[PDB]
Design a protein around this ligand. Structure first.
Ligand code: MG
Ligand code: MG
Lengths: 502, 502
């Protein structure tokens, strides 16, 4: 019943949301699509982005040793960080020539990064950024935290994706990001170089964080405020295929250039997974329309990418009307990272059918209010639905890979829901681990407040409050709730009594 | 007796009346006040009541039966508020507009032209516009002269984040009336509403109690208003900006409302302002008490009328400066007078006011004042003679007067009948001797959400049951019916309702 002794307890972070913020300004990375996106005049006036700027952030780039000690002090034994591609290669790697292999239908089944390609990439990489990430990773290991390294977390180098150019011309001029197959080739070089660089201190790799968010938000949901903020159906399907293609070739390249077991316990020297945000879809009724909309949305967001990278089954229509198998894409995943925040309740609409989305549940509730199921609601308007964690893991379990909960958290700047959020969700997780025994860790989002993308700093996810002026960390009560659960390896009934539904 | 076309009616606001729908499809979460009353810190510290506007009386869906109720008791006029946040839930800052700036920094022109209206129409929530159009049309169908208030305290969250302002002491926003851009955006909103509603609306009100917004916002935190700061610098700036916003809105309403909905209206756009006038009684005839009463009367009652009637600007708010802008003179067609009670004060040397307890707004709720008068549930002294004194202060500026608010928090309805009879016989005497008051709007028709106090303060002539939303008229609604329908206070009624012995 208690969580197994080796169960991972930690937090997740990303480069763009954490790193910048130093007082002297020396650590600013202006060379991402997201950096240019949040500084865009038009985006700011329109309310597409918050107007907050990442360069005023919490300064994880220089303060990482303090945050790591904070994480250890509350019983964390694991931690995920993101590497900013734009930091390693501020200037294009397009001139390193590299052998490639193409499937009949056009997919890249192989990017031949050899010794000479590594040498040329070593001459283009920012040695300063590499050594800092090494110092970051080594500080985790020194404090006894197992390191998870994510290679891409939304942001792309500006020479890979200029979102203002893509938006203004509707993808006539670029660089076009994941719409362009060239991005697959460069991401493959970047992945190979990082595995060669850090393979001796990293065993748990992640290629992409929420790749389906990058594509949906970038090309089919402009309301969410992501670059390039278009609604182009063919560009959405192309980016999905390309980013899924990129994972496969990076998976093989990481396996080639990471042959060192940093930890003797690691299941292999290069244990490569993907972080995927799973949303349990709940049909509003058992009517045809509602059931058909739920099935379709579950297929596109939850299942489509996993059929690609685990089964090798490609559906270029994104709606389940086509199946094309590439044997070389089969079983290209070692473990799966499950991000869960809340569910979606949907209706089906006659059009063929299209999701409607019912309000009062899931992602569409009254901020600070109560959902129609009697659950508290975050500052983001998100329903606290702890049972959905079990639903999300059941969907993930279909693909037969070991699971880790890589993100789970709440926007709550005053911390009056987060303790119950931790107690209720970890109760569900504890029973799930004993029952199904295929989940091996819990990574909370996050240790500290950070820059919540298009929402800026006004969404506070941290177990620790951060004063943006002084960069001072002030742990919240929920950090103690986390400490108790992680240290005692169980959810004590005391915590269940003390933190009921607020 | 009152003249034949004397206005008998009531006033209301969007935030205090609209929400309540059980589903509830009408929830407007995008105001500073919505986030303000849902704030757990405010609720925990007693800043706000803990009651939520989503559980209110649902005037948004039930307006037809409330208007029939109003006409049922002899009303011929009704003031409603438009929620800016409902019309423009997303920022309008990218709708570019030419502006003119006085050398002292005041915005003298906001060039809302036809192109600006078209772009604003692309952003407006057409569902909200049509509902307000329905509410106004239903009022006309019952012989109720419509008064439309453009702003009644609440602001869009993209205009004012009161938590960010409070937490950061105005270092992070958006900052509402502290920021001059609010004037520009309010000007665009006023121009759009005149364009869209001008053929059905002739009596316009820019702001309801603007000095209450700034005073309670930036110099009186115990009132419980957002952002709950005390900051005289911000108090001055907000006073100047909201007065600036009235003048430009006045000019743009008259530009885009060229249609006389009623052929006997004074003009196509009769633009007024609703100002709460507090008769200030010095405690004694000493210099200290007289100097403090003069200052208090100047800052609260007179300062903003010096701004928008005479175009005289006082940057200090204490009578130390004098700046004339001819572009600002006579920017007012009529003056709505809100009167609730007086203030008795002393002067203390620091000369600032020292409010004498037992009179006016500072009595023990449900008790007796030191002048022997009944006291509302709010702790407000019932002082009907102050109505004549408040209209005297109003009369100095040479504009037609309408009593736009007058009422009492009295859930048991044991004082309201005397309150009604006594205030209105004072008003009747004033009307025949001064002949410059043309209406009486009671606050309010039904119980509503009384801001920081929630539903505890019941001002309605009609009680409301929040479980079923059922309206239950009080005895005092019959008193109002008799007085309004007979166009005089029958001496029978003065006998029935004398000043109670407690
Ligand atoms: Mg390794
Ligand atoms: Mg008109």
């Amino acid at each position: 019943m208690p969580f197994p002794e080796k169960f991972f307890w930690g937090a997740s972070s990303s480069g763009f949301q954490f790193e910048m913020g130093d007082p002297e300004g020396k650590s600013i990375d202006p060379n991402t699509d997201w950096f240019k996106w949040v500084h865009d005049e038009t985006n700011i006036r329109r309310g597409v982005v918050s107007g907050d700027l990442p360069e005023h952030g919490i300064n994880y780039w220089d303060l990482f040793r303090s945050d790591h000690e904070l994480a250890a002090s509350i019983g964390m034994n694991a931690y995920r960080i993101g590497i900013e591609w734009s930091r390693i290669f501020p200037k294009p790697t397009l001139d390193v020539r590299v052998g490639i292999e193409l499937d009949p239908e056009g997919y890249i089944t192989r990017v031949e990064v050899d010794d000479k390609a590594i040498e040329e990439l070593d001459l283009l990489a920012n040695k300063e950024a590499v050594s800092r990430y090494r110092e970051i990773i080594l500080d985790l290991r020194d404090r006894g935290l197992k390191v998870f390294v994510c290679l891409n977390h939304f942001t792309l180098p500006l020479w890979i994706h200029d979102p203002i150019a893509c938006r203004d011309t509707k993808l006539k001029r670029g660089p076009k990001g994941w719409v362009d197959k060239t991005t697959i080739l460069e991401f493959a070089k970047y992945s190979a170089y990082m595995a060669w660089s850090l393979g001796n201190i990293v065993d748990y790799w992640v290629t992409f964080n929420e790749p389906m968010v990058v594509t949906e938000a970038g090309y089919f949901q402009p309301e969410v405020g992501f670059p390039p903020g278009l609604r182009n159906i063919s560009a959405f399907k192309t980016a999905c295929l390309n980013i899924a293609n990129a994972h496969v070739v990076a998976y093989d390249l990481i396996k080639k250039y990471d042959k060192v077991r940093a930890d003797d316990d690691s299941p292999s020297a290069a244990y490569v997974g993907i972080v995927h945000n799973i949303v349990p879809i709940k049909p509003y009724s058992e009517r045809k329309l509602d059931l058909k909309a739920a099935d379709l949305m579950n297929y596109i967001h939850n299942k489509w990418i996993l059929e690609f990278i685990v089964r090798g089954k490609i559906d270029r229509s994104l709606v389940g009307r086509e199946k094309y198998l590439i044997d070389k894409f089969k079983d290209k995943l070692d473990w799966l990272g499950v991000n869960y925040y809340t569910r979606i309740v949907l209706k089906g609409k006659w059009v063929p059918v299209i999701p409607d989305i019912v309000k009062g549940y899931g992602f569409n509730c009254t901020p600070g209010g109560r959902s129609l199921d009697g659950m508290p609601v975050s500052d983001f308007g998100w329903e606290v639905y702890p049972q959905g964690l079990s639903d999300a893991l059941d969907i993930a379990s279909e693909y037969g890979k070991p699971l880790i909960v890589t993100e789970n958290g709440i926007a709550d700047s005053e911390d009056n829901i987060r303790p119950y959020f931790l107690v209720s969700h970890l109760k569900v997780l504890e029973e799930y681990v004993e029952k199904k025994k295929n989940v091996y860790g819990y990574l909370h989002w996050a240790l500290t407040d950070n820059y919540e993308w298009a929402q800026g700093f006004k969404m506070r996810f941290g177990l620790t409050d951060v004063d943006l002026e002084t960069k001072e960390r002030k742990p919240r009560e929920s950090s103690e709730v986390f400490k108790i659960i992680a240290s005692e390896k169980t959810v004590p009934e005391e915590l269940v009594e003390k933190y009921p539904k607020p």
